[PDB]
Write an enzyme that holds these catalytic residues in place. Sequence first.
Site, PDB file in Angstrom:
ATOM      1  N   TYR A   1     -13.943   5.850 -20.819  1.00 43.19           N
ATOM      2  CA  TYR A   1     -13.812   6.585 -19.566  1.00 43.19           C
ATOM      3  C   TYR A   1     -15.159   6.581 -18.862  1.00 43.19           C
ATOM      4  O   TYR A   1     -16.187   6.788 -19.501  1.00 43.19           O
ATOM      5  CB  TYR A   1     -13.369   8.028 -19.837  1.00 43.19           C
ATOM      6  CG  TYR A   1     -11.939   8.140 -20.309  1.00 43.19           C
ATOM      7  CD1 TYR A   1     -10.885   8.047 -19.407  1.00 43.19           C
ATOM      8  CD2 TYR A   1     -11.638   8.137 -21.670  1.00 43.19           C
ATOM      9  CE1 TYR A   1      -9.576   7.918 -19.845  1.00 43.19           C
ATOM     10  CE2 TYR A   1     -10.336   8.004 -22.117  1.00 43.19           C
ATOM     11  CZ  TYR A   1      -9.308   7.884 -21.201  1.00 43.19           C
ATOM     12  OH  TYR A   1      -8.026   7.645 -21.641  1.00 43.19           O
ATOM     13  N   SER A   2     -15.165   6.227 -17.580  1.00 41.97           N
ATOM     14  CA  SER A   2     -16.381   6.296 -16.771  1.00 41.97           C
ATOM     15  C   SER A   2     -16.879   7.731 -16.769  1.00 41.97           C
ATOM     16  O   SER A   2     -16.092   8.661 -16.634  1.00 41.97           O
ATOM     17  CB  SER A   2     -16.105   5.876 -15.324  1.00 41.97           C
ATOM     18  OG  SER A   2     -15.755   4.511 -15.224  1.00 41.97           O
TER      19      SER A   2
ATOM     20  N   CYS B   1     -14.945  -0.442  -8.423  1.00 42.76           N
ATOM     21  CA  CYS B   1     -14.356   0.187  -9.596  1.00 42.76           C
ATOM     22  C   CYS B   1     -12.958   0.702  -9.313  1.00 42.76           C
ATOM     23  O   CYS B   1     -12.669   1.184  -8.222  1.00 42.76           O
ATOM     24  CB  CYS B   1     -15.241   1.331 -10.093  1.00 42.76           C
ATOM     25  SG  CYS B   1     -14.819   1.928 -11.736  1.00 42.76           S
TER      26      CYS B   1
ATOM     27  N   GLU C   1     -16.328  -3.065 -12.310  1.00 37.65           N
ATOM     28  CA  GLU C   1     -15.678  -2.455 -13.461  1.00 37.65           C
ATOM     29  C   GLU C   1     -14.245  -2.091 -13.104  1.00 37.65           C
ATOM     30  O   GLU C   1     -14.001  -1.098 -12.422  1.00 37.65           O
ATOM     31  CB  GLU C   1     -16.430  -1.204 -13.889  1.00 37.65           C
ATOM     32  CG  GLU C   1     -15.889  -0.561 -15.145  1.00 37.65           C
ATOM     33  CD  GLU C   1     -16.693   0.650 -15.544  1.00 37.65           C
ATOM     34  OE1 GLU C   1     -17.776   0.463 -16.135  1.00 37.65           O
ATOM     35  OE2 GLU C   1     -16.279   1.779 -15.211  1.00 37.65           O
TER      36      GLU C   1
ATOM     37  N   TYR D   1     -10.009  -2.077 -14.579  1.00 35.90           N
ATOM     38  CA  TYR D   1      -9.317  -1.822 -15.843  1.00 35.90           C
ATOM     39  C   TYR D   1      -7.813  -1.639 -15.684  1.00 35.90           C
ATOM     40  O   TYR D   1      -7.113  -1.574 -16.713  1.00 35.90           O
ATOM     41  CB  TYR D   1      -9.916  -0.590 -16.527  1.00 35.90           C
ATOM     42  CG  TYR D   1     -10.190   0.578 -15.600  1.00 35.90           C
ATOM     43  CD1 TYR D   1      -9.219   1.549 -15.367  1.00 35.90           C
ATOM     44  CD2 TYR D   1     -11.464   0.779 -15.057  1.00 35.90           C
ATOM     45  CE1 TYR D   1      -9.509   2.696 -14.628  1.00 35.90           C
ATOM     46  CE2 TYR D   1     -11.765   1.923 -14.323  1.00 35.90           C
ATOM     47  CZ  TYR D   1     -10.781   2.881 -14.117  1.00 35.90           C
ATOM     48  OH  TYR D   1     -11.077   4.044 -13.445  1.00 35.90           O
TER      49      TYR D   1
HETATM   50  C1  LIG Z   1     -14.762   0.808 -18.650  1.00 32.35           C
HETATM   51  C2  LIG Z   1     -13.479   1.599 -18.456  1.00 32.35           C
HETATM   52  C3  LIG Z   1     -13.527   2.731 -17.780  1.00 32.35           C
HETATM   53  C4  LIG Z   1     -12.381   3.506 -17.565  1.00 32.35           C
HETATM   54  N1  LIG Z   1     -12.481   4.628 -16.867  1.00 32.35           N
HETATM   55  C5  LIG Z   1     -11.440   5.411 -16.676  1.00 32.35           C
HETATM   56  C6  LIG Z   1     -11.566   6.679 -15.870  1.00 32.35           C
HETATM   57  O1  LIG Z   1     -12.608   7.099 -15.374  1.00 32.35           O
HETATM   58  N2  LIG Z   1     -10.402   7.421 -15.719  1.00 32.35           N
HETATM   59  C7  LIG Z   1      -9.175   7.041 -16.233  1.00 32.35           C
HETATM   60  O2  LIG Z   1      -8.171   7.733 -16.040  1.00 32.35           O
HETATM   61  N3  LIG Z   1      -9.115   5.856 -16.924  1.00 32.35           N
HETATM   62  C8  LIG Z   1     -10.163   5.056 -17.179  1.00 32.35           C
HETATM   63  N4  LIG Z   1     -10.002   3.879 -17.838  1.00 32.35           N
HETATM   64  C9  LIG Z   1      -8.713   3.486 -18.555  1.00 32.35           C
HETATM   65  C10 LIG Z   1      -8.653   4.283 -19.849  1.00 32.35           C
HETATM   66  O3  LIG Z   1      -9.556   3.765 -20.796  1.00 32.35           O
HETATM   67  C11 LIG Z   1      -7.346   4.174 -20.658  1.00 32.35           C
HETATM   68  O4  LIG Z   1      -6.915   2.775 -20.654  1.00 32.35           O
HETATM   69  C12 LIG Z   1      -6.184   4.845 -19.884  1.00 32.35           C
HETATM   70  O5  LIG Z   1      -6.599   6.201 -19.720  1.00 32.35           O
HETATM   71  C13 LIG Z   1      -4.890   4.803 -20.556  1.00 32.35           C
HETATM   72  O6  LIG Z   1      -5.085   5.142 -21.957  1.00 32.35           O
HETATM   73  P1  LIG Z   1      -3.935   5.923 -22.736  1.00 32.35           P
HETATM   74  O7  LIG Z   1      -4.447   6.190 -24.044  1.00 32.35           O
HETATM   75  O8  LIG Z   1      -3.555   7.015 -21.846  1.00 32.35           O
HETATM   76  O9  LIG Z   1      -2.763   4.819 -22.790  1.00 32.35           O
HETATM   77  P2  LIG Z   1      -2.043   3.705 -24.014  1.00 32.35           P
HETATM   78  O10 LIG Z   1      -1.377   4.834 -24.674  1.00 32.35           O
HETATM   79  O11 LIG Z   1      -2.910   2.756 -24.739  1.00 32.35           O
HETATM   80  O12 LIG Z   1      -1.173   3.018 -23.003  1.00 32.35           O
HETATM   81  C14 LIG Z   1      -1.714   1.881 -22.437  1.00 32.35           C
HETATM   82  C15 LIG Z   1      -0.930   0.703 -22.864  1.00 32.35           C
HETATM   83  O13 LIG Z   1       0.461   0.787 -22.421  1.00 32.35           O
HETATM   84  C16 LIG Z   1       0.697  -0.309 -21.524  1.00 32.35           C
HETATM   85  N5  LIG Z   1       0.845   0.037 -20.047  1.00 32.35           N
HETATM   86  C17 LIG Z   1      -0.022   0.743 -19.221  1.00 32.35           C
HETATM   87  N6  LIG Z   1       0.372   0.837 -17.959  1.00 32.35           N
HETATM   88  C18 LIG Z   1       1.600   0.141 -17.901  1.00 32.35           C
HETATM   89  C19 LIG Z   1       2.561  -0.136 -16.810  1.00 32.35           C
HETATM   90  N7  LIG Z   1       2.468   0.238 -15.503  1.00 32.35           N
HETATM   91  N8  LIG Z   1       3.656  -0.854 -17.121  1.00 32.35           N
HETATM   92  C20 LIG Z   1       3.802  -1.268 -18.401  1.00 32.35           C
HETATM   93  N9  LIG Z   1       3.008  -1.087 -19.489  1.00 32.35           N
HETATM   94  C21 LIG Z   1       1.893  -0.359 -19.169  1.00 32.35           C
HETATM   95  C22 LIG Z   1      -0.284  -1.399 -22.008  1.00 32.35           C
HETATM   96  O14 LIG Z   1       0.174  -2.040 -23.227  1.00 32.35           O
HETATM   97  C23 LIG Z   1      -1.559  -0.550 -22.201  1.00 32.35           C
HETATM   98  O15 LIG Z   1      -2.388  -1.196 -23.166  1.00 32.35           O
HETATM   99  C24 LIG Z   1     -11.125   3.093 -18.081  1.00 32.35           C
HETATM  100  C25 LIG Z   1     -11.101   1.883 -18.810  1.00 32.35           C
HETATM  101  C26 LIG Z   1     -12.225   1.161 -19.012  1.00 32.35           C
HETATM  102  C27 LIG Z   1     -12.067  -0.125 -19.815  1.00 32.35           C
END
Ligand SMILES: Cc1cc2nc3c(=O)[nH]c(=O)nc-3n(C[C@H](O)[C@H](O)[C@H](O)COP(=O)(O)OP(=O)(O)OC[C@H]3O[C@@H](n4cnc5c(N)ncnc54)[C@H](O)[C@@H]3O)c2cc1C
Length: 295
Positions: free
Chosen positions: A71-72, A253, A293, A295
Amino acid sequence: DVPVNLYRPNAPFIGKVISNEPLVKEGGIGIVQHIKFDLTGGNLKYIEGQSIGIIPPGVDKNGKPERLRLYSIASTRHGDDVDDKTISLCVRQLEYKHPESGETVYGVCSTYLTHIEPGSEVKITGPVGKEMLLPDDPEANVIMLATGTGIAPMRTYLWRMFKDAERAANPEYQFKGFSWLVFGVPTTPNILYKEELEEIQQKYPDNFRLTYAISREQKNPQGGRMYIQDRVAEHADQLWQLIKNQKTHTYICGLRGMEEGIDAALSAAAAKEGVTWSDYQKDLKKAGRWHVETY
Ligand SMILES: Cc1cc2nc3c(=O)[nH]c(=O)nc-3n(C[C@H](O)[C@H](O)[C@H](O)COP(=O)(O)OP(=O)(O)OC[C@H]3O[C@@H](n4cnc5c(N)ncnc54)[C@H](O)[C@@H]3O)c2cc1C
């Protein structure tokens, strides 16, 4: 000088949640929370542009521990209260579709974080990232192209640049360049930090320009919904003229797939002067002036 990996996944920092505020106002789409953590009891230091990892509790469907999500960082190095004791995140709850087993799937770590209580302990790793760092040059121009939660690193720059308590806390950095935020969101109630962004534009009308692309409320010239790429095409000649300055840095971003429309606008603008944008953009990346950046 840049802190990196002060904590790693094998022995994370255990912080406590202080607050968890909603950022999306009534009438908006989805859930985006501002979450502040207590950093006292550890030595987590960070600067602007970096990220931290969060390790959510539980196991995936195979029975394995859930891994970290990045998370940023949404606060400056000093924290929101400018006391050097806290860190903040800007987290959107992820949820989606029927062609992915069941009906609506909820993201593990983003659901965990957006419904987390004050007092709760959280596993934190990092900081990580040297790709989105801010130049210490007070006369730099800073273009910021954000959608949704990509506002997070931008808020750390702008607060450092323009908050009064920050200016009193950072004697070495008194910003006097020009900065321009183009912020893409679906509704006006979805403009994260709307009130604080617009206060900055009132105090510093010569140092900060704020431009919105609000898709459910604005149409582009072709009749479709206004997205950030439509706003970048609108101002592509101006943005190109600023990018030619040796002092100018551009930050992009947000969610993946916004880079393609930004390049096609900047390509048409550069072409008028005989420059190939994709060639010019490579030199900018090597020079450390093009920061991405997504994602
Ligand atoms: C450098 C960086 C910075 C980030 N900063 C932020 C930030 O500031 N705020 C923020 O909210 N997030 C940010 N993110 C994204 C964050 O890391 C997580 O990926 C995001 O919050 C979702 O994680 P989760 O655990 O909620 O989802 P998971 O439970 O892992 O669900 C995600 C998975 O489900 C699937 N999926 C996701 N969306 C869809 C869709 N529309 N249709 C179908 N399948 C889908 C994919 O397989 C994905 O891998 C950032 C990511 C990176 C890499």
